[PDB]
Amino acid sequence: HPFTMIMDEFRAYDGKCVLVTGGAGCVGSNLTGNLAKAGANVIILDNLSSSYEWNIPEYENIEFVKGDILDDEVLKRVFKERPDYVFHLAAHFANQNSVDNPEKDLLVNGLGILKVLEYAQLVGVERFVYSSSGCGVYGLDSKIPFEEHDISISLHTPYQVTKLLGELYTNYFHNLYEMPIVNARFFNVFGPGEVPGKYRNVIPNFFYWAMNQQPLPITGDGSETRDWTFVEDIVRGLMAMGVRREAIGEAINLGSGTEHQVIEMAGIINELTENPAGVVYRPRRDWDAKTRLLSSIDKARRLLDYEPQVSFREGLERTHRWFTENWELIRKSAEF
Amino acid sequence: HPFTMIMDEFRAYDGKCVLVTGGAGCVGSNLTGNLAKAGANVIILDNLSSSYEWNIPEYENIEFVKGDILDDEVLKRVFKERPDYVFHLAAHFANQNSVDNPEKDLLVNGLGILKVLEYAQLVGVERFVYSSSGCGVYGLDSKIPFEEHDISISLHTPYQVTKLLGELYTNYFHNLYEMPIVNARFFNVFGPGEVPGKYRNVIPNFFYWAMNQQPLPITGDGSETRDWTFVEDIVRGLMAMGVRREAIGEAINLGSGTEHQVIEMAGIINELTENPAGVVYRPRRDWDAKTRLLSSIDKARRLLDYEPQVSFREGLERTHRWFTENWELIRKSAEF
Ligand SMILES: NC(=O)c1ccc[n+]([C@@H]2O[C@H](COP(=O)([O-])OP(=O)(O)OC[C@H]3O[C@@H](n4cnc5c(N)ncnc54)[C@H](O)[C@@H]3O)[C@@H](O)[C@H]2O)c1
Ligand SMILES: NC(=O)c1ccc[n+]([C@@H]2O[C@H](COP(=O)([O-])OP(=O)(O)OC[C@H]3O[C@@H](n4cnc5c(N)ncnc54)[C@H](O)[C@@H]3O)[C@@H](O)[C@H]2O)c1
Ligand SMILES: O=c1ccn([C@@H]2O[C@H](COP(=O)(O)OP(=O)(O)O)[C@@H](O)[C@H]2O)c(=O)[nH]1
Ligand SMILES: O=c1ccn([C@@H]2O[C@H](COP(=O)(O)OP(=O)(O)O)[C@@H](O)[C@H]2O)c(=O)[nH]1
Numbered sequence: 148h149p150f151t152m153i154m155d156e157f158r159a160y161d162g163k164c165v166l167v168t169g170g171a172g173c174v175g176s177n178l179t180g181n182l183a184k185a186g187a188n189v190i191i192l193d194n195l196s197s198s199y200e201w202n203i204p205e206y207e208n209i210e211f212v213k214g215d216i217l218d219d220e221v222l223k224r225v226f227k228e229r230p231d232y233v234f235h236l237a238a239h240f241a242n243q244n245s246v247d248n249p250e251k252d253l254l255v256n257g258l259g260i261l262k263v264l265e266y267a268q269l270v271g272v273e274r275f276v277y278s279s280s281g282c283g284v285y286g287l288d289s290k291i292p293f294e295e296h297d298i299s300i301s302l303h304t305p306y307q308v309t310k311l312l313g314e315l316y317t318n319y320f321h322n323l324y325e326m327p328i329v330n331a332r333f334f335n336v337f338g339p340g341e342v343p344g345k346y347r348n349v350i351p352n353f354f355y356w357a358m359n360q361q362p363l364p365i366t367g368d369g370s371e372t373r374d375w376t377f378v379e380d381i382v383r384g385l386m387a388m389g390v391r392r393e394a395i396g397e398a399i400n401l402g403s404g405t406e407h408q409v410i411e412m413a414g415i416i417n418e419l420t421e422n423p424a425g426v427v428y429r430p431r432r433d434w435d436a437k438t439r440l441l442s443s444i445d446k447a448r449r450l451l452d453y454e455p456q457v458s459f460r461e462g463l464e465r466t467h468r469w470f471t472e473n474w475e476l477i478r479k480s481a482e483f
Numbered sequence: 484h485p486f487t488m489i490m491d492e493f494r495a496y497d498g499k500c501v502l503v504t505g506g507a508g509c510v511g512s513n514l515t516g517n518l519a520k521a522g523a524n525v526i527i528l529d530n531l532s533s534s535y536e537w538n539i540p541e542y543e544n545i546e547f548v549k550g551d552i553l554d555d556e557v558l559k560r561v562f563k564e565r566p567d568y569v570f571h572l573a574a575h576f577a578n579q580n581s582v583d584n585p586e587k588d589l590l591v592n593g594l595g596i597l598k599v600l601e602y603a604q605l606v607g608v609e610r611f612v613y614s615s616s617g618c619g620v621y622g623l624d625s626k627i628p629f630e631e632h633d634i635s636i637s638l639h640t641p642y643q644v645t646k647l648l649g650e651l652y653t654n655y656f657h658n659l660y661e662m663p664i665v666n667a668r669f670f671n672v673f674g675p676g677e678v679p680g681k682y683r684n685v686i687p688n689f690f691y692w693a694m695n696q697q698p699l700p701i702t703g704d705g706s707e708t709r710d711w712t713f714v715e716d717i718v719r720g721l722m723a724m725g726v727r728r729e730a731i732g733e734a735i736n737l738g739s740g741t742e743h744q745v746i747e748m749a750g751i752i753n754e755l756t757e758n759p760a761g762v763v764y765r766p767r768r769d770w771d772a773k774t775r776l777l778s779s780i781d782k783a784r785r786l787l788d789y790e791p792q793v794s795f796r797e798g799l800e801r802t803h804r805w806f807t808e809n810w811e812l813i814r815k816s817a818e819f
Binding site for chain 2: 246249250253254257258261262265284298300301302303304305307308311312314315316318319322323398433434436
């Protein structure tokens with residue numbers, strides 16, 4: 148097998164204490180499962196504001212703490228366990244939600260990461276890994292494909308603003324207090340573990356609508372593109388970031404390095420679900436000025452030996468399977 | 484006289500309603516005086532957390548509202564007047580204060596500017612001018628002299644972080660809602676109107692100590708440099724930013740474009756005050772990693788016809804005069 152660094156680099160988590168904020172969500176549920184498999188003791192802190200307790204994997208060594216990253220009482224409760232690793236995935240999500248609710252977005256994404264960083268400073272951590280966003284740091288003035296040095300300060304939603312703000316604070320803690328941080332810049336993550344809903348991503352919403360035989364609403368002309376990254380590839384990146392010394396202090400894109408049109412994505416989902424309803428065209432969402440996103444993943448290749456293992460098609464099949472296996476829980480949980 | 488654009492460009496403020504948040508402070512007191520002279524009706528919103536009511540100039544057309552930019556009640560009180568211009572100078576100041584009190588710094592600098600921007604959106608403004616910071620947006624990875632495109636996301640204090648955050652939000656309101664914003668990047672402002680104190684700038688603190696015949700404490704070796712910008716030059720820049728259409732959506736350095744050593748600055752102050760106590764050397768402050776600051780002011784030249792009129796020496800003489808004329812008020816007010 149070629150998977151020597153994926154397997155034995157990660158055994159480094161065995162017996163370690165890992166706090167995952169936002170651990171009941173899409174990336175979090177996948178990450179926490181893999182950490183538990185690697186023998187970590189995992190603490191999830193999540194307020195379930197955009198996630199469901201049933202999504203958390205069932206492992207003896209995962210402890211679920213329902214609470215808010217803005218609440219200093221619960222923060223002391225988890226940080227007195229002295230986590231060796233913090234993966235900070237909790238966030239007010241995402242673009243539209245943030246335009247509607249900019250102050251709550253700042254409190255959760257700004258004051259929330261600041262508090263979590265402050266407690267991490269008090270106890271000391273081997274690593275603090277933050278889920279930043281490609282959309283959040285690359286602007287219309289950034290060249291495609293996006294390289295990590297080529298960030299923008301001219302953004303289109305409060306979510307984008309506060310994703311960058313997170314990097315501003317992790318870099319600050321690194322610079323002044325020598326905290327070993329890593330800034331992961333995710334690109335349109337998808338896969339098992341994202342329940343559909345009003346403020347959620349297009350792929351799970353399209354699966355939900357397609358499986359109710361509804362037409363898929365395309366917000367644009369369909370030629371808009373995204374770099375969609377399968378969640379298990381994201382997780383492999385994150386786990387590498389926790390242990391590689393060369394990741395310390397760095398910002399690193401986690402993407403597929405390929406782009407697909409919205410119309411293709413919709414076609415694949417309709418094909419897999421045997422949806423006869425096709426698509427309908429709607430106007431672009433007003434804040435959606437960045438209609439092409441494509442990452443450069445060469446830095447991740449260099450520092451992490453990161454390489455996506457799952458094709459777009461394979462990813463969508465795995466997503467479909469999760470939908471069919473959990474359809475009743477999803478039906479009940481989805482809030483539009 | 485050569486001052487045609489300084490004089491008749493600014494008559495544009497005559498009869499206009501101008502809100503100046505942070506208006507009782509150093510830059511604010513100077514700005515509000517000049518706006519009142521130009522015939523503007525001025526509303527100051529200031530909580531006096533680092534300023535004194537005696538500093539506000541006495542003009543019939545200045546209305547002082549004691550209140551907090553985080554308080555939605557007082558925000559409605561000032562914004563129902565329908566200001567034509569907003570100059571947003573209110574800020575939790577500055578580097579050390581922010582390291583000590585990072586959460587309050589974020590609430591004031593982040594949530595505060597967000598709220599003020601939200602109300603400006605509701606009423607509509609001809610211009611929203613924000614006092615960002617050279618120190619806040621240029622890093623160790625930025626080339627000296629600092630040009631406006633060459634920003635950094637790797638900062639050294641929470642104040643630097645939240646100064647950049649302000650630009651992130653003004654750019655957002657410009658991008659999504661077409662708010663006519665301008666981001667002014669000030670470089671080490673000095674002059675009449677800054678009372679000395681624990682968390683204040685070096686020049687007024689040095690005047691206060693020198694006028695008590697105390698040695699001036701140099702935090703470093705004295706070869707550290709700053710681009711010190713006289714407050715009346717800053718004010719001329721700001722007033723141009725309010726009226727020039729070419730400033731809309733732009734980030735622009737307001738500096739002197741020259742650097743001076745700390746040791747020279749100290750020597751001049753000791754000379755003017757006839758201080759016999761000289762200097763003493765202390766360690767660098769731990770967050771003070773940027774020991775050279777120098778702006779490029781060519782963009783301001785191009786867009787605003789900005790040109791500093793007051794030399795470093797002349798500026799320090801004017802500062803000295805303000806100290807001697809207000810010595811008793813300063814003695815009483817200074818909090819160390
Ligand atoms: N999904 C993407 O395409 C994408 C892209 C870039 C970045 N990210 C980032 O990655 C992280 C995880 O994304 P995701 O897709 O799993 O989203 P998600 O919504 O599934 O996960 C976030 C979790 O945080 C929780 N949370 C929200 N506010 C909280 C608060 N105040 N206190 C505690 N918990 C709170 C939610 O309940 C949720 O379970 C987020 O930081 C997100 O911004 C995601
Ligand atoms: N002085 C400099 O060298 C420099 C450099 C770069 C940027 N700036 C920026 O320029 C602006 C003005 O600077 P300054 O030198 O006049 O500082 P200052 O402290 O004299 O002025 C700021 C004012 O804001 C007020 N304020 C603070 N918190 C408030 C709150 N929550 N609500 C309402 N009012 C509040 C203070 O009481 C004060 O009068 C600030 O935004 C500052 O960050 C200054
Ligand atoms: O109901 C939808 C939602 C999204 N999209 C398109 O899908 C792509 C990604 O949308 P998503 O909201 O998942 O992520 P983001 O826009 O934040 O990248 C964008 O081009 C959207 O215009 C769509 O066609 N229909
Ligand atoms: O008591 C002091 C305060 C400051 N400085 C020096 O003066 C310069 C500017 O300091 P200030 O705090 O005024 O502004 P900032 O450091 O935020 O630019 C820096 O090189 C400081 O090290 C000093 O020598 N003694």
